[PDB]
Structure 1
Amino acid sequence: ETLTVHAPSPSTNLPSYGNGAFSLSAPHVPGAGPLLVQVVYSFFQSPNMCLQALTQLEDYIKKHGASNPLTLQIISTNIGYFCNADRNLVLHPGISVYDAYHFAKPAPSQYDYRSMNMKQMSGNVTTPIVALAHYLWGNGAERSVNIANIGLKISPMKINQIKDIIKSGVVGTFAVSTKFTHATGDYNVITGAYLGNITLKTEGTLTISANGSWTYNGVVRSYDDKYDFNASTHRGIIGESLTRLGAMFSGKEYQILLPGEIHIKESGKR
């Protein structure tokens, strides 16, 4: 059986992340002196802030029991800070995570999932936690993230069709039009956590010199219309964390749309 976490609402939220006993911050580095805001500000832009918050939730559940009322309230509350941050990210593309997280109005402690949850996730470092939020409270509603927001890094030499042109030894310009699987959790621990392995379509131009130098210019879109958020599609260490949490707490699986397209330009050698 699994335990129900109540949705963040102003009437049930703790006054503070972590009930004010712990917070989301950069790691203490012995010998470095005072923790300064420039270090915190970079920590918050990086994937470690997401993993840190998941790790604090796990520690907490472990130390105090998954079914301890205050544990349930921490999970609800801390997850709430992340949804709130992520809304400010979606609403104000361009701002830093540190700013979206700490200086949003309304206060994070006032986050109301029922009235404020969004269908669109930012795709920034807060997203894996927001996507767990939707598992817990979204009742199966479909969500989305734009393909421009997921930090895709494509290697054209690992796509069979382009790899083959490059290996064949031909010279000049060649059309490419193919599908491929792309394991985002091999290099992006954020995207991987909630999208994992995706399928993509590319079309474009592969230019190769006689010297073995090549550029692929192309457009990339999702091949599947949507992806499942469940225990089995998570990838990477943040995803392992999401799975341990979803196995403990009630929720509903759901799907994620991956609309839009990106333009890539990548280069290499034979």
Structure 2
Amino acid sequence: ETLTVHAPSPSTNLPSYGNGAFSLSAPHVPGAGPLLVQVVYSFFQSPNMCLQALTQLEDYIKKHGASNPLTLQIISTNIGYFCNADRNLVLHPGISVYDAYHFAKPAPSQYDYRSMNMKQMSGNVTTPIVALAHYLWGNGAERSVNIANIGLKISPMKINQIKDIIKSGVVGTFPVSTKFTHATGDYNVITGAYLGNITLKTEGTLTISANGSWTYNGVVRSYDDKYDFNASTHRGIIGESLTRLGAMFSGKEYQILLPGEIHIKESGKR
């Protein structure tokens, strides 16, 4: 049976991520000389910063035990840093992850889940740990992430209706209207962790030239209204970490809406 991690709050949080004993930063590269802020800044924008934070938690639980009260404080506190950074990304689209995580107000040591938690997630590299925060403390409340924020990369050759038109050898302009499964964890370790496989709808025009060059121009929206967050639906290496942690601690599954639409323009040659 699972242990309960208390929600982050100013009266319970540790004064620092990691109780100050470790921090989230770029990896040590022997022979590189001192680690400078440009390297850390780029690291914070990368998915590696999310895998690293989760690896730190799992390493800590293994060494010190999931039921050591300090382990539970480090989980509550560190995940609060991700929640605080993600709130700042939602409120300030356009800012870097390093700026949102380090220079936000209020201070991440003061993060209070009950009063501060947002229903919308940013879709940036902080999102998978925030999605875990909701399982631990959200009591089942529905969340959302806009589809424009999840880094979709659509491959029209992998969409049966479009693949069929291209392979048929036809030349001219053709309407497309189809649903298709899309495995975000085949290419996006962040989105794959909490949305995994999704189902999409696209409507558009496929133009194919006589030389076999083609362009697909179309709109993409989610087919399903929402997606379940549980141990089973996560995909990719960060999703595996989320699965191991959710097995250990109490929580409530919840659903994530995927509102919005994107416009895509993709090309290739037959």
Identity of aligned residues (%): 100
- Give, in angstroms, the shift of residue 41 of structure 1: 0.1
Which SS does the other structure have where 1:66 is aligned? coil
CA distance in 1, matches of 2:47, 2:16: 22
CA distance in 2, matches of 1:201, 1:254: 23
CA distance in 1, matches of 2:138, 2:59: 25
Which SS does the other structure have where 1:42 is aligned? helix
CA distance in 2, matches of 1:137, 1:113: 8
- Give, in angstroms, the shift of residue 225 of structure 1: 0.0
- Give, in angstroms, the shift of residue 210 of structure 1: 1.1
CA distance in 2, matches of 1:163, 1:185: 21
- Give, in angstroms, the shift of residue 181 of structure 1: 0.3
CA distance in 2, matches of 1:210, 1:198: 34
Specify every segment of 5 or more residues in structure 1 that has no aligned partner in the other structure, as ranges.
none
CA distance in 1, matches of 2:105, 2:160: 48
- Give, in angstroms, the shift of residue 129 of structure 1: 0.1
User: Could you list the per-position Cα deviations for residues 53-85 of structure 1 after superposition, in whole angstroms to 9, with x for gaps in the alignment?
Assistant: 000000000000000000000000000000000
CA distance in 1, matches of 2:256, 2:112: 22
CA distance in 2, matches of 1:209, 1:253: 48
CA distance in 1, matches of 2:158, 2:2: 41
- Give, in angstroms, the shift of residue 151 of structure 1: 0.2
| Aligned 1:124-135 pairs, distance under 5 A | 124-135=124-135
Which SS does the other structure have where 1:251 is aligned? coil
| TM-score in terms of structure 2 length | 1.00
CA distance in 1, matches of 2:105, 2:212: 54
CA distance in 2, matches of 1:241, 1:269: 39
CA distance in 2, matches of 1:174, 1:105: 51
| Aligned 1:70-81 pairs, distance under 5 A | 70-81=70-81
Specify every segment of 5 or more residues in structure 2 that has no aligned partner in the other structure, as ranges.
none
| TM-score in terms of structure 1 length | 1.00
CA distance in 1, matches of 2:102, 2:172: 52
- Give, in angstroms, the shift of residue 269 of structure 1: 1.0
User: Could you list the per-position Cα deviations for residues 71-115 of structure 1 after superposition, in whole angstroms to 9, with x for gaps in the alignment?
Assistant: 000000000000000000000000000000000010000000000
Q: Is residue 184 from structure 1 mapped to residue 184 from structure 2 by the alignment?
A: yes
- Give, in angstroms, the shift of residue 209 of structure 1: 0.7
Count of aligned positions: 270
- Give, in angstroms, the shift of residue 173 of structure 1: 0.3
